[PDB]
């Protein structure tokens, strides 16, 4: 019960092939969620190179709605994985607590779940055992997918375990006897999650288990009048028992109900002495390789937008002056152009001291404020 600098505590929940416990940092008190995978229960090959492949693969799936994995600690008896902790509990417990949800919150959870499944599909991994007991809520009422590929060990060995272990959440293809369960199981599970977020109950529920398999194989489900008919077309296009007509991520992204309230960050791509001191190379002014009659016009166009008051003495000597908004006094400086060579010209700044007035604020910091607004507009 001690990994890294984390002690363990009680048991958060149970999984299909994983025991989820709560870990606590002994100094900071931050809550982590460890996931135990017994090697005695399921282990294809016990070679340490596969553990190296886990360390290389599983950590790099960083997404703001996927639970990030921190490290995979090896053990002769088990495998520990330190996922992050969320204090809002499972989605199924939230549905059993609050019943039917509002449509504007169900779409907000559904977009985040679909953007967590689409990130996994872009990174070539599926979550075949997806259910409202495997998606969590945080404190900020978001949606978090618990295990992206950890369910795959259940699927890899035998499909019969997937049907027997999870009779409710199982695709018609899988119970019909298809070998490999692809992303159509992800779309079907996200449709069951959407029906749970819109109606509260489960669409395929029976007491007798072969009748439950027959109900999953049948493409009919209950529909109340509490939900609008604009989303029941999406549910019928998403919960097809035949995968040729089942919806894709693009077929949800072109639907009308999905595009109503959509945040832009869901989809990454729019198309489908003791201390060390490092020396710094400072410059003098602004090095512009243009014509000298145009640089003064560029400076004038820059300082005209900032509402300054300036006069000239030479054609390249400009004594500018601005009045501060909150501070009653005014600040003055002087720009001058220099010819270091025939190609480039340097714009050099010079300050002048206030002679008689005890001005408040600061002199040189307002001098740098007369320049930090000019460098940005000139951008040279």
């Amino acid at each position, epitope marked *: 019960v001690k990994i890294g600098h984390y002690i363990l505590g009680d048991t958060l929940g149970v999984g299909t092939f994983g025991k989820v416990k709560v870990g606590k940092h002994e100094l900071t008190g931050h809550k982590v969620a460890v996931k135990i995978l017994n090697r005695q229960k399921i282990r294809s090959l016990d070679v340490v*190179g596969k553990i190296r492949r886990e360390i290389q693969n*599983l950590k790099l799936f960083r997404h703001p709605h996927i639970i990030k994995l921190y490290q995979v600690i090896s053990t002769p008896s088990d495998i520990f994985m330190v996922m992050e902790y969320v204090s809002g509990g499972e989605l199924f417990d939230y549905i059993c607590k609050n019943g039917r949800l509002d449509e504007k919150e169900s779409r907000r959870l559904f977009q985040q779940i679909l953007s967590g499944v689409d990130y996994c*599909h872009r990174h*070539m991994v599926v979550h075949r055992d997806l259910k409202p007991e495997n998606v969590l809520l945080d404190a900020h009422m978001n949606a978090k997918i618990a295990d992206f590929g950890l369910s795959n060990m259940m699927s890899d060995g035998e499909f019969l375990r997937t049907s027997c272990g999870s009779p409710n959440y199982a695709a018609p293809e899988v119970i019909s006897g298809r070998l490999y369960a692809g992303p159509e199981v992800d779309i079907w599970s996200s449709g069951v999650i959407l029906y749970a977020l819109l109606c509260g109950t489960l669409p395929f529920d029976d007491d007798h288990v072969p009748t439950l398999f027959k109900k999953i194989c049948d493409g009919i489900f209950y529909t109340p009048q509490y939900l609008n008919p604009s989303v029941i077309s999406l549910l019928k296009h998403m919960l097809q028992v035949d995968p040729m007509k089942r919806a*894709t991520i693009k077929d949800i992204r072109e639907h009308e109900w999905f595009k109503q309230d959509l945040p832009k960050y869901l989809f990454p791509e729019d*198309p489908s002495k003791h201390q060390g001191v490092r020396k710094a190379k400072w410059h003098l002014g602004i090095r512009s390789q243009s014509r000298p009659n145009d640089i003064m016009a560029e400076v004038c166009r820059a300082i005209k937008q900032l509402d300054y008051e300036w006069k000239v003495v030479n054609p390249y000597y400009l004594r500018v002056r601005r009045k501060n908004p909150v501070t009653s006094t005014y600040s003055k400086m002087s720009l001058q152009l220099y010819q270091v060579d025939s190609r480039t010209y340097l714009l050099d700044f010079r300050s002048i001291d206030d002679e008689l007035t005890p001005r408040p604020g600061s002199h040189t910091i307002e001098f740098f404020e007369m320049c930090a607004n000019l460098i940005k507009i000139l951008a040279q």
Partner: antibody
Amino acid sequence: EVQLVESGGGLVQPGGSLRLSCAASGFNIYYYSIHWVRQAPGKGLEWVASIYPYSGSTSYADSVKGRFTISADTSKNTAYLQMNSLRAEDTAVYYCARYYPYFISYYSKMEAMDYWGQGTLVTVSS
Amino acid sequence: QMTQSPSSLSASVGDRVTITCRASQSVSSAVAWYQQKPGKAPKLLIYSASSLYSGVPSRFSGSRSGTDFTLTISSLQPEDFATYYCQQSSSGPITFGQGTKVEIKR
């Protein structure tokens, strides 16, 4: 229940454009990349074309680069290999096959071709 | 962009054969093996050169040694007499092997 029925094959004149399809029945074409292969009589397999509809990225062999425009229609679950400017050497039986790019296991990025069609025989002769 | 080169052999029923596949460039563990009966469709045997595809039983086995992918057929049944194909898939273009045929000893 996956069957990949090819169509549009037969016999063509050299210098004529052909478009053979692959009716993907039993799965969805938008996720999996339909790959075409070439099986010359007596020789081995040879990969020719690829289209991946999920990211919208295609692939091509070096010998058929820029001459065989592959297309995929997600509404009818077909894959259109529109061949153009074919040579006399391109005379083979063309199998259709789906391609599984996903992690079936934690350690193995599966990258093989699971389900294969019967393949139609195109014959090019003057 | 690369090429493949298997061997060619022939053995008896129940013999343990092996087929190498020397990859040209440096590839990952993304090499498959396709059994094609004459006048049939190429059946998949082992997808990542080390783990068995579901379906066909455990007689077919594969090992990986750098860039020399192997296909070993222990206890050769009288139904497994067909042409076997190496297949590189890690890079952009896909290049098949030359294809080894397995003939019965006579």
